[PDB]
Amino acid sequence: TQQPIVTGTSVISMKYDNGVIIAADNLGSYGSLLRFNGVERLIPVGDNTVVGISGDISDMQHIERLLKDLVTENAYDNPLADAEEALEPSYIFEYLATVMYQRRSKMNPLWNAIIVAGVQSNGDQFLRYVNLLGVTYSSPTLATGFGAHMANPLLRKVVDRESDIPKTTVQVAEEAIVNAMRVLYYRDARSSRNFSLAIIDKNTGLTFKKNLQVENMKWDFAKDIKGYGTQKI
């Protein structure tokens, strides 16, 4: 049993016609204090998988080290480490899923909610969630913590069921993700303006975008708001 100290907030993701998009802000919160601003919470594994992690950052850094070892260990006595026997999103997920459930079962959890986004070798979009309890699920849209409450509702308007995935482009999907990040910056008190965004396409490969900022914010209407009811000036 433990308690989380330095924490990262929402990780949001969805799948489109050709691949998957995943995003997460660059903040490390120490309770109410917005302590660290240069924190990357999207961990790329090879060139076909991005692991987005929310929760305790100390446990995140541990999982980050476990993944770099999984790459190293996979390359050992493996002449097809960069071809047929490269790490798959499904391989990386099931490993993390196994660890998370073992740790909960020893009453010493990794205080995290993880989304494994990537594209399989056969071009299939992979997107699956796992948390400190070892609970796992897949959906056309996935989001952790606050994202589950605000991001999912918005991303489900673009892809409500499976049949909507081939109808969704990279432009439409990314635009929906970038909008959802702004909405989280409005209403999540443990969120940041600066975020990272990763696209894994089955054609263009892995595109990792750093130092993105929430833009086009509506604040102008604030000037007109005065008092809490009866105040006129």
Add this chain to the structure above:
Amino acid sequence: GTGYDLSNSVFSPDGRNFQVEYAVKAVENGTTSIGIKCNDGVVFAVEKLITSKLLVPQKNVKIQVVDRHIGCVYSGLIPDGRHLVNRGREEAASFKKLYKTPIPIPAFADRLGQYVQAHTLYNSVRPFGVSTIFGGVDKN
């Protein structure tokens, strides 16, 4: 008398360990493997005896990687070499886990050195039947 060569850790009257020198014969019997240190790196090469046309070309790989920066090739008993690299990999992982930086080549060398030397301290184990050529690039 004699019998100084029947047990591993036993010193002969001339201060030699015959079981170690017998292991060298197993190495000398084996395939030839080399290493060349160039101006900014190292090159490893090995002979692969084609027993028959039935051996799948380019498949039975002998040169093994430790971490991502160290190459290891050996001559003699191939299983004994694999057992040493298995240990080397555990040894390199242990180092990186505590110190963050990937294991320096001299540091890694002594790690294999102490493990192989340990298999000459007791009569309950056999010495390694391989000479291992290894190396790579580090900080300096």
